[PDB]
């Protein structure tokens, strides 16, 4: 046979501290539905000194989707095999591409992370590429997720922003697939992280996440807003969650959706979105009792309210920076 | 300032002979329009003991196209930049993907090659990825290329198989593009190889090609049909050129197109395809005088005619190895 030795490529940050990388490294992949707390959790991990996640890469989910189109089509599958493009070849190529993006698009760290929501649809395949990677699947009440998508007009291919029922059916199908991928991998490899629980109990849930990842505790994860303020956590000013993740963990988004779902969909909730009850969200409750907030997050929420003017300044400065760029795009045309 | 070293990954096989590989290796990229002699020239190189090209990969040009779709769309280019996906990052990922495919889909060799026709539309970008790669651009009379496409019903996105004029205009645009890329790189990097001249004068043209690539002459390149017969050259039974390249270099396809172009297109030829004259093909001639055939290729042509029943058998065995697969594809239904 022929064997392909891939020694460790590496990263040198300042002071020549070496950071080797290969497919066997203990990567962290975070995903789930868009608008389910995925940026929050990756920013809380970025706040840890040992972990770097950084911004959404966009190219990783797009490559994974294109690869699915190839191997799903029987004729193309056969053409690839007859060209020598076996699974072993395609996996080597895909893993190399993905690993280069993760390594190079941010600063080095002892543990590297990626967050691109729909990568968790491909978690079983990513475990084949990266055998020691671990996965965090964000879970959030589908009614909150769809309310966010619709009120913030987040564009997702195939989501009809005029239609709550259609978006909840899409949410339901996506989460059925992602939850199944997660459980196929099992608890040694994939941890479901419940958004409302993480918000209500950030110290206990961050402890649980860090234990699962085998990363020591650090209180720095409870001060992520300060590290954003001094550019210690990388954000894209074009991502839609930036103006929320700049704030401390807070209670404001748990149940904003209540009373904004059309009555026929509230009636049909259990049939429209059966993943709600499967995941622990009562489809008859508007809202469920997600639990009692820790004093830490009650205090954060009160302090944000006291600084409402400071925060609205930052949220407007952000939309201003969004405006400069949509100028630089009408000028690129 | 972050430095990213990538030590030589390598191949080893029988006797543990090491073959290191990285982006600086002297790769060979072959391309041009489909139906221009690209499989012939890659098979003549495969006949050299130092060079391995192998079958079309398909995924390499498809990834190149997807990358162009990203960077050319101004909104998407801005989102990538604000995610940290700089050209430096994207180039590292693209080069890693393409290199893994080239290395792993075939047997190892001192010099690795790839042939996928439309990669040469991206030759300037590939030189950025692989600075010591060299390029061969096949050139063939556009009338012969379009006749082949239409008569053999070769599906190419955007080519109307019922319309010679439209196909010749597509050919003309594609070759203006590929020829421009080749000349941007210049003669130290890209050699135009004329199909009709390679067929008429194989010893002198293969001398020129091998000197350009810095590979020593070997008479094996004039015996490629024998090396196919003992499995020293990899062929896809699903590629449309396999039944032609199994024969010795021969004269039968130089001017088959003559008398098969609609009258009105013949009358308008210089206006329909101005690239013909630019490349040296007289658009007023049906056919141009491509030159005088070497006696080597005249003799090959005569011998093929003598063994026509032996060649008909292999052509049939290829069509039947095709139907076995087209059964296995409707079985996937």
């Amino acid at each position: 046979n022929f064997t392909y030795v891939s020694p460790d490529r590496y990263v040198l940050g300042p002071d020549s501290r070496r950071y080797p990388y290969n497919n066997d490294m203990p990567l962290i992949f975070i995903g789930g539905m868009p608008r389910s707390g995925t940026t929050l959790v990756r920013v809380l991990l970025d706040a840890h000194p040992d972990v770097r996640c950084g911004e959404e890469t966009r190219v990783i989910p797009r490559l994974l989707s294109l690869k699915q189109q190839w191997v799903k089509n029987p004729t193309e599958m056969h053409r690839l095999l007859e060209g020598g493009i076996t699974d072993e070849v395609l996996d080597a190529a895909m893993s190399a591409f993905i690993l280069e993006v993760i390594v190079r698009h941010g600063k080095p760290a002892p543990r590297l992370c990626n967050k691109d929501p729909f990568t968790l649809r491909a978690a079983v395949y990513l475990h084949r590429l990266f055998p020691r990677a671990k996965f965090l699947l964000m879970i959030r009440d589908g009614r909150a997720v769809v309310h966010s998508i619709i009120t913030r007009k987040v564009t997702i291919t195939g989501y009809d922003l005029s239609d709550y029922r259609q978006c909840l059916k899409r949410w339901n199908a996506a989460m059925t697939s992602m939850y199944a991928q997660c459980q196929q991998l099992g608890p040694g490899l994939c941890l479901p992280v419940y958004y409302e629980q993480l918000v209500l109990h950030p110290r206990a849930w961050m402890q649980r996440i860090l234990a699962f990842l085998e990363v020591p505790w650090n209180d720095s994860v409870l001060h992520h807003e300060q590290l954003i303020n001094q550019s210690g956590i990388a954000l894209s000013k074009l991502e839609r969650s930036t103006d929320q993740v700049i704030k401390p963990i807070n209670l404001g988004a748990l149940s904003k959706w209540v009373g904004h779902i059309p009555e026929d969909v509230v009636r049909d909730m259990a049939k429209v979105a059966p993943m709600l009850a499967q995941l622990g969200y009562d489809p008859a409750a508007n809202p469920p009792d997600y639990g009692q907030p820790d004093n830490f997050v009650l205090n954060n929420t009160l302090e944000i309210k006291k600084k409402m003017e400071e925060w609205q300044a930052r949220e407007r400065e952000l939309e201003e920076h969004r405006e400069l760029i949509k100028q630089s795009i009408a000028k690129k045309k | 300032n972050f430095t990213y070293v990538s030590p030589d990954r390598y191949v080893l096989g029988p006797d543990s002979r090491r073959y290191p590989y990285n982006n600086d290796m002297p790769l060979i990229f072959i391309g041009g329009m489909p139906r221009s002699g690209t499989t012939l020239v890659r098979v003549l190189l495969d006949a050299h003991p130092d060079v391995r090209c192998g079958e079309e990969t398909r995924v390499i040009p498809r990834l190149l196209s997807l990358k162009q779709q990203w960077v050319k769309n101004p909104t998407e280019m801005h989102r990538l930049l604000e995610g940290g996906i700089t050209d430096e990052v994207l180039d590292a990922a693209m080069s890693a993907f393409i290199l893994e495919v080239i290395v792993r889909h075939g047997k190892p060799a001192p010099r690795l090659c790839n042939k996928d026709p439309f990669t040469l539309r991206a030759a300037v970008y590939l030189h950025r990825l692989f600075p010591r790669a060299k390029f061969l651009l096949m050139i063939r009379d556009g009338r012969a290329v379009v006749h082949s496409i239409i008569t053999r019903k070769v599906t190419i996105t955007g080519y109307d198989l019922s319309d010679y004029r439209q196909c010749l205009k597509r050919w003309n645009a594609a070759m203006t593009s590929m020829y421009a890329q080749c000349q941007q790189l210049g003669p130290g990097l890209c050699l135009p190889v004329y199909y009709e001249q390679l067929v008429l004068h194989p010893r002198a043209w293969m001398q020129r090609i091998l000197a350009f690539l810095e590979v020593p002459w070997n008479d094996s390149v004039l015996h490629h049909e024998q090396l196919i017969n003992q499995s020293g050259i990899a062929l896809s039974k699903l590629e449309r050129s396999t039944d032609q390249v199994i024969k010795p270099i021969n004269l039968g396809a130089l001017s088959k197109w003559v008398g098969h172009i609609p009258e009105d297109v013949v009358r308008d030829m210089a206006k329909v395809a101005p690239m013909l004259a630019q490349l040296g093909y007289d658009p007023a001639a049906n056919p141009p005088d491509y030159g005088q055939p070497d006696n080597f290729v005249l003799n090959n042509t005569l011998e093929i005619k003598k063994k026509m029943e032996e060649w008909q058998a292999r052509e049939r065995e290829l069509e039947e190895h095709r139907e076995l697969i087209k059964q296995s594809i409707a079985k996937k239904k």
Partner: peptide
């Protein structure tokens, strides 16, 4: 391109 694609 949309903000996201499944």
């Amino acid at each position: 391109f949309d903000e996201y694609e499944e």
